[PDB]
Each structure stands twice: as structure tokens, then as C-alpha cells.
Amino acid sequence: KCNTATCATQRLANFLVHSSNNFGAILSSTNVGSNTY
Amino acid sequence: KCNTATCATQRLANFLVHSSNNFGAILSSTNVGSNTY
Amino acid sequence: KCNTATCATQRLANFLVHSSNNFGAILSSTNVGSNTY
Amino acid sequence: ATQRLANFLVHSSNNFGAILSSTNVGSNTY
Amino acid sequence: ATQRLANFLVHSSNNFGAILSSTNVGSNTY
Amino acid sequence: ATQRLANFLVHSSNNFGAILSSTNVGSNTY
Amino acid sequence: KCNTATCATQRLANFLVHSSNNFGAILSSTNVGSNTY
Amino acid sequence: KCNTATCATQRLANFLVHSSNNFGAILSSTNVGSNTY
Amino acid sequence: KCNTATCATQRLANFLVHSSNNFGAILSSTNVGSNTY
Amino acid sequence: ATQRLANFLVHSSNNFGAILSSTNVGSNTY
Amino acid sequence: ATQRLANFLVHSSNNFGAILSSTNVGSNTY
Amino acid sequence: ATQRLANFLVHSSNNFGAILSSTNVGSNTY
């Protein structure tokens, strides 16, 4: 592959699995800047 | 492949699986800037 | 492929699977700037 | 058993220059 | 058993210059 | 058994220069 | 005037003189909300 | 005037003279909310 | 005036003279909220 | 004495949901 | 005396949810 | 006397939820 000189190689492979197998209630909220008077 | 000189190679492959196999209620909210008077 | 000099190569391949196999209610809201008087 | 009620109100206002007034009751600004 | 009610109100206002007034009751601004 | 009620109110205001007033009751600002 | 009882009296008289006997330039300005781009 | 009882009296008189006998330049400004870009 | 009882009296008189006999320049400014970019 | 210039630009954008964007360049709000 | 220039740019963006963005460059709010 | 230039840019961004962003460059708030 690189017989003589100057063979710089960066190897990388990414695997990403985000599994959300819900079976129940997920009651989420996000109040940003809201002002309940 | 690179017999003599100057063979710079960056390898990369991305896999991404976002599986959301819901079976129940997901009650979400987002109140940005809202003001309940 | 690159016998002599100056062979810069960037490899990349992307896989993306966003599977949302819902089986239930997804009650979502987004109140931006809304003001309930 | 006699009741007397009196209310004198003299609201006098004069302006000779400038007035800037702002009032945001239950108002917003984005 | 006699009741007397009186209300004197003299609301006098004079202007000789400029007035700027703003009022946003329950109003918004985007 | 006699009751007498009196209220004298003389609200006098004069301006000869500038006034800047701000009031944000229950208001927001983003 | 008030011989027996109950004589409440409020006295008041207002004098106001706003004399502006100008003899020279009065260069005034008022930029409210104006935006000079 | 008040020979027997209950004689409450409030006395008041106001004099106000605002004399501005200018003889020269009065260069005034008022930039409220103005934004010189 | 008040021979027998209950004679409450408040005396007051106001004099106010605001004389501004200018003979020269009065260079005034007021930058409220102004933003010179 | 040879010069070679190359520019490869692949600007790919995908949306599958909501986007709210605001931009006030040199603007004001009263 | 040979010069070679290359520029590879792959700007990829994906969205699957919500984005709220605000930008006030030289703006004001009263 | 040979010069070689190479620039490699892969700007990849993914979103699966919410993003709130604010930026006030030279902006005010009263």
C-alpha cells in the first residue's frame, strides 16, 4: 500500500443506535420563558 | 495503492438508527415565550 | 491506483434510519409566543 | 341620627413641556 | 334619620407643550 | 347621634420640563 | 359665619405665570422612536 | 366665625412664576428610543 | 373666632419663583434608550 | 508554472419536523 | 513550479424535530 | 518547487429533538 514514504492515514467508522422501545406513559414538559400569571 | 510518497487518506462511514417503537402515550409539551395570564 | 505521489482521498458513506413505529397516542404541543389571556 | 357626607376633589394638572408615558398592562414584546 | 350626600369634582387639565402616551392593555408585539 | 364626614382633596401637579415614565404591569420582554 | 357647629372650610387660590420672553434662538429637538439608518 | 364647636379650616394659596427671559441660544435635544445606525 | 371648642386650623401659603435669565448658550442633551451604532 | 483550482461544495439540508427562525438585523421593537 | 488547490466541502444537515432560532444583530427591544 | 493544497470538510449535523437558540449581537433590551 505505502511502500516508500509519507503514508498518513486516519481510520474511523461510527455506529449509533438510539432505540426507545417505550411501553408506558412519557409525560414530558419544557417551559422556556413561559410565565404563568 | 500508494507506492512512492504522499498518500494521505481519511476513512469514515456512519451508521445511525433512531428507532422509536412506542406502545403508549407520549404526552409532550413545549411552552417557549408563552405567557398564560 | 496512486503509484507515484500526492494521493489524498477522503472516504465517507452515511446511513440513517429514523423509524417511528408508533402504536399509541402521541399528544404533542408547541406554544411559541402564544399568550393565553 | 343625622349623617352628612361631603367630598371635595379638585384634580388640577398643568403641562408646559414634554411628557412621554408608556404602560404595558399584561402586554408582551418579542 | 337624615342622610346628605355631596360630591364636588373639578378635573381641570391644561397642556402647553407635547404629550406622548402609549398604552398596551393585553396587547402583544412580535 | 350625628355623624359628619368631609374629604378635601386638592391634587395639583405642574410640569415645566420633560417626564419619561414606563410601567410594565404583568408584561414581558423577549 | 359658623356660629354653632360643623364648619369645615378649605380655602385655596392659584396664581401661575409662565412668561417666556425669548430674545434668541431656541433650537429644540425630540426624537422619540426615530431610527436614523 | 366659629363660636361653639367643630371649626376645621385649611388655608392655602399658591403663587408660581416661571420666568425664562432668554437672551441666547438654548440648544436642547431629547433622543428617546432613537437608534442612529 | 373659636370661642368654645374644637378649632383645628392648618395655615399654608406657597410662593415659588423660578427665574432663568439666561445670557449665554445652554447646550443640553438627553439620550434615553438611544443607541448610536 | 501551472495552477489548478477546484471547489466541491455539496450543501444538503433535510427537514422532517418544524423550524421556527427569527432574524432582526438592524431592526427595532417598541 | 506547479500549484494545486482543492477544497471539498460537504455541509449536510438533517432535522427530525423542532428548532427555534433567534438572532438580533444590531436590533433593539423596548 | 511543487505545492499541493487540499481541504477536506464534512460538516454533518443531525437533530432528533428540540433546539432553542438565541443570539443578541449588539442588541439591547429595555
Swiss-Prot record, chains D, E, F, J, K, L:
GO terms for biological process: amylin receptor 1 signaling pathway; amylin receptor 2 signaling pathway; amylin receptor 3 signaling pathway; amylin receptor signaling pathway; apoptotic process; bone resorption; cell-cell signaling; eating behavior. The modification Tyrosine amide is found at Y30. GO terms for molecular function: amyloid-beta binding; hormone activity; identical protein binding; lipid binding; receptor ligand activity; signaling receptor binding. Its main location: secreted. Keywords: Amidation, Amyloid, Cleavage on pair of basic residues, Disulfide bond, Hormone, Secreted, Signal. It is found in: Secreted. GO terms for cellular component: extracellular region; extracellular space; neuronal cell body. Amyloid fibrils are degraded by insulin-degrading enzyme IDE. The mature protein is largely unstructured in the absence of a cognate ligand, and has a strong tendency to form fibrillar aggregates. Homodimerization may be the first step of amyloid formation. Can form homodimers. Interacts with IDE and INS. Interaction with INS inhibits homodimerization and fibril formation. Belongs to the calcitonin family. IAPP is the peptide subunit of amyloid found in pancreatic islets of type 2 diabetic patients and in insulinomas. Amylin/IAPP is a glucoregulatory peptide hormone that plays an important role in the regulation of energy homeostasis. Selectively inhibits insulin-stimulated glucose utilization and glycogen deposition in muscle, while not affecting adipocyte glucose metabolism. IAPP function is mediated by the CALCR-RAMPs (AMYRs) receptor complexes. Amylin can also bind CALCR receptor in the absence of RAMPs, although it is more selective for AMYRs. This is Islet amyloid polypeptide. It comes from Homo sapiens (Human). The gene is IAPP. The chain holds residues 41 to 70 of 89 of the full protein.
